[PDB]
Amino acid sequence: RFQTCRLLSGNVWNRELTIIQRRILRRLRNRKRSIKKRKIYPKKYLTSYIQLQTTRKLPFFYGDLPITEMHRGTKRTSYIPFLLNLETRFDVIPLRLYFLETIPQARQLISHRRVCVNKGMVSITHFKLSHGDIISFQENNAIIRGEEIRRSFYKEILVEKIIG
Amino acid sequence: IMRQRVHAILFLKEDEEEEERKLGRPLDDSVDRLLDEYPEFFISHDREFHVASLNYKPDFKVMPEGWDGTIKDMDEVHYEISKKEDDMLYEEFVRRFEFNKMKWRGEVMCHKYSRRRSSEGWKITVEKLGAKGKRGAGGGWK
Amino acid sequence: VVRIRLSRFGCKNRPFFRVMAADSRSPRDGKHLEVLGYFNPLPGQDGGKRMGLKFDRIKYWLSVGAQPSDPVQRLLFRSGLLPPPPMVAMGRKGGARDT
Amino acid sequence: FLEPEYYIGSWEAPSDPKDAERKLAQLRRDYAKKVRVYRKEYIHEIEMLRVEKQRK
Amino acid sequence: VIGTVVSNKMQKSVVVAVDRLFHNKIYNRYVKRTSKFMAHDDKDACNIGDRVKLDPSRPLSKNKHWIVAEIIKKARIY
Amino acid sequence: PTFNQLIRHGREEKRRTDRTRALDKCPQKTGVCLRVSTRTPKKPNSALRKIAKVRLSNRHDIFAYIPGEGHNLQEHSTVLIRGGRVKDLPGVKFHCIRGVKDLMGIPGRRRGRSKYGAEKP
Amino acid sequence: GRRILNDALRTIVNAERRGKASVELKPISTVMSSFLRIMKEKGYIKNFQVYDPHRVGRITVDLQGRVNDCKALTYRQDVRAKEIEKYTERTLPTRQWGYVVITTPDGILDHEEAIKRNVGGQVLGFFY
RNA sequence: AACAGUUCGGGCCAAAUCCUGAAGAAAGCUAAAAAGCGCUGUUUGAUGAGCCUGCGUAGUAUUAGGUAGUUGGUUAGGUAAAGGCUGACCAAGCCAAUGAUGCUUAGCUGGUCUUUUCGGAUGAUCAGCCACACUGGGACUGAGACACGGCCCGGACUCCCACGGGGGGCAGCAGUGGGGAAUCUUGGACAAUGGGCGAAAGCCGAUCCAGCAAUAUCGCGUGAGUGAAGAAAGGCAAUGCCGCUUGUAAAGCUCUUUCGUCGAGUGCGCGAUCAUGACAGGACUCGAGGAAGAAGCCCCGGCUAACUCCGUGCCAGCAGCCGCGGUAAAACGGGGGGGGCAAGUGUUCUUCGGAAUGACUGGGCGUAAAGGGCACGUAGGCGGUGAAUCGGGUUGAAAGUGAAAGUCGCCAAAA
């Protein structure tokens, strides 16, 4: 949600920024994000401020799971459950890394629809798969998302970039 | 490339040809046709294990004054452990992709028949095994 | 009477038996002399069948004179070391499959 | 790997009206003597193993 | 096994003392603790102050399940 | 001191007294209110505070404060007692949980409604 | 372990950080001579000339100037051969270095020579 | 597992493999005289019991003496088995400052929680062992009890009685009443595993399933997507910049219908075993098929992420701590707004960490709490050298054991 970008003092990838949203992001981004991040030197735990900002960026990136809790599940700090969930959580990581929106678009897909792995449906939504795993849609998924991935790879990598 | 990458290239283009036959001369290749090199990073590995070692624990071992020996190189001892990992990697992925290929035609669901018992185990020296078959005894094989 | 037998060893509704040389009046899960491997009674996927047993000591305990129970013969003949069950008489007629 | 493989038939128990003593005789003598034989084998072979351990 | 006698007036029931170590790793010290044994001894022959070896036996009294052996280092008595 | 002294001596822990003395370690023990007395807090804080002398089911009698504004309590009203100590008024080490047994929670509070036993307006 | 040992080692250390270069220790010993030599050929000193093999007692040690805290243990304790891998972690620089010194039936070792020969004994000293 | 035999009386209303004597120890039976079973003894092996013992196994000294079967010895019994187990007699020991005897707490162990580690808190569920069975007391049978639904005795307590006497034991399973802060259904089935007797067909609230509990776990879901008329309302504003904001939020609209709901269809697998299904109105696969059935609490003075308007005025009240309230309260209360978590949240209780705040790892005692007024000396600790010997400690190697479950590494299935 855009409100979260407003909180994070920046741009959390809201889609289709309407006109006054354009205005408000220019205002917030420049004025606020500058003034705070530009030249302050606060004792205001800038380390811990940064910490909040990053631990708040990441959850939307991976949908809505609490990642402080992921940290906490192990006794380490970080980087291991990171490399792990990114080795796969199987819908939010791979389906987005190739062709989707990691959000409950790419979620609930594994809930109801199928993406059979090694022709095997794995409808758990948090799987970890590595080292020799065939990822395949169903055919009634294909007959639509072939067109969807085409209109993605072009309307959203050719068209939007080129109007940019 | 990476070896197993190549392997999956083989498999995928192969069954893609098999389904080319199926779906007729309509062949998609739409997004594949993209060969402009702006909208892509796609960094691919040729070596492996160059980002950082398995660890860098600060630890040492002193050799006396008359060491009369020659030291080893760190970049050199690196890639030996990478080669160990690489061989283990090839073996394990071969095995896994292999079983997935043999799995392309199997049964993982609610239906089986289940009359063989896979006679097995010695728990001190178990490098031999056997099976049973159905109501016939069988044995000694596999 | 050492009764080489099979005790349940697992989660509810999906068990897993285990082979142990017990004593008669010991509990089902009670003080065992030693386990003897395992026997998973669940059908699988690699070879969609069941697995499990050990050898090389069931010889010794049979020799010293264990009288076990027939739900263990259902394995100690299927892997040899015994004669078949003397109650393998007949078979239900009319099994039908369509998948 | 030095293990055999063969087949056994121990069927045809019910044949005539109400004379299960066929398979009963089977059970008693057949099965008892079977197991007894096996056990004898085991005794001798395992004590063989023991005497090997002593020679060791 | 080894030990030293402490009391004698028992008429075939000479009593000796033997110590050991109750080493508690936690505080990492070799400490000493004793347990005062009793041993049957025919031909009653010992003097307070002279060591002796023992060896185990079936019960011989309400206590005193040891058995005496040779008198190591019989000591003078003024 | 020296290890030898430590081997032959306890190295015993430091002793402190937990203030709460409910008969058991139970989280709350119910009781009946003997008398309701409003008392004045120690300085600097200045006000009148509503507390009730309650005899717990263990039979020990402890003074317990009522949190929130408004009490329906009368002699012998049965009120579950939690362990909460107010700093301003000395000698009261217990709290009464609103909305349970007899003391009735304040319906009006809309923020913090879970405490004060308030159903959702 | 003795206390004349602790004494020799502490006199070494204190003379070092005082800045003199050649010292003499009256009450001498074999376990101390062995230890001076061990330090020597591990590097930490310069010469360790013992004088009177018997009956009198005198060593003259002339020193380099390395770090050398080297406390000499008093309360005995075992050391197996396979326990040093964790026990020599309780030196000052837990990881890097210092040589926990061990005594064996096959001569007084340090922990390197020990874990090589797979022999044990009892700890005697530290190195830092 | 092997070796040797199972003969006669007699008694039990009738007879027995019931009892009882003799020899040898017993006992004979057959599925219309039939083999095959049994029983007794000899010899082993296994499982198990009994007994004994080294070591380790609470606090308390404002508990310093305790004990006369006591401590030993002989003799008889004793026991299946050594022994003050014992009677007798003999001799007077034994335990105690390494804390005996008292007094208080308590079932022990693998282990559960925490801690990097040590340690500390716990011993509930699950298993090893001991103990215990209304309260006491015994003893009999029996391989195997002093035996929880075995016996006798006393007590105490209940329950019926004809009135004499009988009867009663949930600390088996579920279930009532009691006390509490509060801890489940008066379920189902031997379907499986496991124990029992039966040569074989056959019997069990152990067990396996089921049942209620946000009691914890792990999940998975309460949608995807558009969506500016920035809707109305909601607040706040000098009431600038759609004034700010709720707010792409809703609304609308197109997908999607998993989890769950409805209806169908079974050697799939749990008996895949000969057969044996309670689970099972389960799954399994197929179909009606609508975002429609699924978002709450805590916090916003600092510690500590987050703030504003009004009410409030030393009253009310919050506070885990420091403290706020005497008309501008960001701390109390109400409206709006926001942060943190999420089918869960918050308070209290409970134990560890932080806590080096009992310091072995990991302290102090000059002025901060803490060096005794001083010494002596008992144990006790600790404490010179070189030479020799031994090999208890020490240390190197092997096997046994260190229950399984647990921790942990890996692996694989499982969601």
What whole-number distance in Å separates Cα of residue G48 and Cα of residue G40?
Answer: 8
Half-sphere exposure for G28 (CA within 13 Å, toward CB)? 21
Helix (H, G, I), strand (E, B) or coil at D45: helix
- CA–CA min distance F16, chain E (Å): 26
CB A109 within 8 A of CB A91: yes
The pairing of strands E32-40 and E66-68 is: parallel
Q: What is the DSSP letter of C31?
A: -
The pairing of strands E51-56 and E66-68 is: antiparallel
CB F50 within 8 A of CB F79: no
What whole-number distance in Å separates Cα of residue F112 and Cα of residue A95?
Answer: 43
The approach used to solve this structure was cryo-EM
Structure tokens, E61: 């009294």
What whole-number distance in Å separates Cα of residue D28 and Cα of residue D19?
Answer: 15
D32 CA to H266 C1' in angstroms comes to 41
A70 CA to H106 C1' in angstroms comes to 43
Give the one of B128, B136, B140 whose C-beta lies nearest to D4's C-beta: B140
Q: Which chains touch F (3 or more CB pairs under 8 A)?
A: E
Least Cα distance to F36 among F85, F102, F109 occurs for F102
CB G97 within 8 A of CB B63: no
Distance of CA B109 to the CA centre of its chain: 25
Q: How far is CA F21 from CA A78, B61, F24, F29, F80, in A?
A: 44, 60, 8, 11, 16
F89 CA to H323 C1' in angstroms comes to 14
Least Cα distance to G80 among G107, G102, G106 occurs for G102
What whole-number distance in Å separates Cα of residue E47 and Cα of residue A123?
Answer: 88
Name the helix (H) or strand (E) containing E4: strand E2-7
Least Cα distance to G107 among G45, G43, G31 occurs for G31
Strand partners, F96: F81
B114/C56 CB distance under 8 A = no
Helix (H, G, I), strand (E, B) or coil at F96: strand
Residue with tokens 């294990």: B49
What whole-number distance in Å separates Cα of residue C76 and Cα of residue B119?
Answer: 10
3-state secondary structure chain A: CHHHHHHCCCCCCCCCCCHHHHHHHHHHHHHHHHHHHHCCCCCCCHHHHHHHHHHHHHHHHCCCCCHHHHHHHCCCCCCHHHHHHCCCCCCCCHHHHHHCCCCCCCCCCCCCCCCCECCECCCCCCCCCCCCCCECCCHHHHHHHHHHHHHHHHHHHHHHHHHC
B130/D6 CB distance under 8 A = no
Helix (H, G, I), strand (E, B) or coil at B11: helix
- CA–CA min distance G27, chain E (Å): 27
Name the helix (H) or strand (E) containing F52: strand F49-56
Structure tokens, A75: 């006794």
ω into residue F44 within 30 of 0, thus cis?
yes
Chain C: residue whose CA lies nearest to B99: C46
Q: Is E30 on the interface with F (CB under 8 A)?
A: no
Least Cα distance to C52 among B120, B124, B127 occurs for B120
Q: Which nucleotides of H are covered by protein (CB under 7 A)?
A: 1-2, 31, 36-37, 45-48, 51-57, 59-60, 70-74, 82-85, 91-96, 98, 118-119, 126-129, 179-182, 192-196, 199-200, 206-210, 219-228, 230, 241-242, 244-249, 256-259, 267-276, 279, 283-285, 291, 296-300, 305, 314-325, 333-336, 338-342, 345-351, 357-361, 363-365, 371, 380-387, 393-397, 403-404, 412-415
Resolution of the entry in angstroms: 3.9
What whole-number distance in Å separates Cα of residue E3 and Cα of residue E19?
Answer: 8
Helix (H, G, I), strand (E, B) or coil at E5: strand
Q: What is the DSSP letter of C80?
A: S
Q: Edge to edge, what strands does the sheet with G59-62 contain?
A: G22-25, G59-62, G47-50
